[PDB]
């Protein structure tokens, strides 16, 4: 019973976007059984970033998803050893990102290590021109496969000139030792940028995230 | 108004799958403000279908979606002229379908005409080996774009031997006269095959479908 | 045997693009063992088309591909019964087309029947705004799979205001009577529009197309 | 000038595939104006790798492509400063890789630094089951866009028990300074594994690669 009602975390990311290398370090905290967490990030290398912060924000904590008692909480059940997760983001104008992450627990602190590679973003598109204004709230479709947990999302970044910039997410959640899987279910999420300095070298985020069955079941 | 609390519809489909031609005709009914409708289909040419009925079932009625008052009901507003809808289905083993449809109103009955082309299904896959057993309930992400309404879904067919077979839907809803569009929102659906003979030449379906904002808003 | 060194063909297409229905009829001729053929097309219904002709031109004859003696010519061998072909076109701005075709033979005359559905073309993209100026020459990668022949191409339309508009082709060629398949090989093609009236309701085309092994073999 | 008729290179890769971290160091040499080069790799962290080596082999040197004098050799022109390249690999069973690379020149040796993230490979697919046995020779379609050079390839791995495993490559070559771009053209390549130990912790490769116009031009 190592996951307490209040848990902190530390995170480090090493990333590249369109050839630009960067490193980010941060700290966060939250209420894993309530579905709330916050994180504060500093760009330690490669700042100011020449692309939109918004593509990085969902890579900084699903052990914090609230689950109903009848849905196995695969990510919480994976501790204390923890889990790895990986992701594809397919952007509608041809950008592609892959992400790989390790989640562990030491001394009561979650430790998150992230690597990120984004490629093929057009020079005049909204990522490289910094035209995005945050994510809409989203709904992930999850299911078990291959002994692990997978999920997909149709997400959207709001645009300064109006309209949306569409991104498909595909994620894989992989316990370090096999633990109990849920069935077909959904996770609702809303991620807010709650603070940032003028060139996004210091950034604060809040996420609400909760799992559930389809409403018609 | 012109759309009554109870409305009947007639539908005809001409299609092809992996070089196999077929035609289907049917009749349905439902309650457009309550979010449900039913339909009875007969394969009138090309039966018995050498592929899974389930890939056809979502092409047989979104004027029937229940919408809250604060979300403009674009498809209902499009009548009496009505609307056209188009779709891509991307299957995880490479099958691809496009669909085009016309929806009109004639003497108090909705009239649906559907054209369907499905290609590249593997000979050994669940579609051509008839290994599927219905869709999970689903959730569509919709937004306005290009003066029309668009939406995407991550759907899944249950496999008879266990597991899921994954399908991405992208739809386009196009009113024949430009009427009020909604913002970013979601539609939940659940489609059930309620009757079928052994070779699926006579089939009946039931769908529940309703629009809503994201739960966290 | 049945395929002479000069052969004529007739073709008919029923199609839809972004809700616009049309029909085209044509007549062609060529030298199947030499790798060239020509065709003249007339829009009989739905002209003038509200989109670029170029997306239709490659749907009007691969029995005319020149093959070296050591690569089985699947499509020629399929006659007199003939073959079916299907295809996906994935356009980089989200347009998707599927196509299904039947090829038959009547005394010296090939008979081509095509159905085409194209969806999700942006209103202001180069297809709906008629901004394309023909295809580059291309190179298809083919291989046997599932007892039929498949092939993929990275193609490109030239744009009037310079640059290219990218399209991926996936094709499936299915003989109506089992005949010998080749292994992994390539087909080079170049299709030219050689005449058109102002609104593209009358068009003539020339195609050169020849198969070969990879040059390093 | 700086690119001599014979050139050596050193390479290091940091990668992750399905959660498995690894590092590889290597050394190569070749004839940049003739289109031939060889490389020798050793795994230095993470061996033996739990996946097919073949997905790594094309990430180890396009400055060695032979170009005819009439096609601008953008990568050679980029030196001595050099170029960066990025890549997406889309595998037919859902695996996705992104790659990012820096190419520089030091003490008369090219220096290559690669980062690689591979995700979503099925546990029973041919990559994680090590069921592949090298690439077919291939042909890349290249064009200028957005101030850089881009290319795509339909590639294929041979399967030990027969058949092929298909993979689409999208590459982006980004000179560190704005050196002249070519037009629409093709690059043929053939990569062979020439030596390896059983667990692929020691591997030797050879590549032939040459650029050209389409053959019909």
UniProtKB/Swiss-Prot annotation, chains A, B, C, D:
Thought to play a role in photoprotection of the coral's resident symbiont microalgae's photosystems from photoinhibition caused by high light levels found near the surface of coral reefs. In deeper water, the fluorescence may be to convert blue light into longer wavelengths more suitable for use in photosynthesis by the microalgal symbionts. Contains a chromophore consisting of modified amino acid residues. The chromophore is formed by autocatalytic backbone condensation between Xaa-N and Gly-(N+2), oxidation of Tyr-(N+1) to didehydrotyrosine, and formation of a double bond to the alpha-amino nitrogen of residue Xaa-N. Maturation of the chromophore requires nothing other than molecular oxygen. It holds the Pfam family GFP. GO terms for biological process: bioluminescence; generation of precursor metabolites and energy. Homotetramer. Keywords: Chromophore, Luminescence, Photoprotein. It comes from Discosoma sp. Belongs to the GFP family. The lineage of its organism: Eukaryota, Metazoa, Cnidaria, Anthozoa, Hexacorallia. Fluorescent proteins have become a useful and ubiquitous tool for making chimeric proteins, where they function as a fluorescent protein tag. Typically they tolerate N- and C-terminal fusion to a broad variety of proteins. They have been expressed in most known cell types and are used as a noninvasive fluorescent marker in living cells and organisms. They enable a wide range of applications where they have functioned as a cell lineage tracer, reporter of gene expression, or as a measure of protein-protein interactions. This is Red fluorescent protein drFP583.
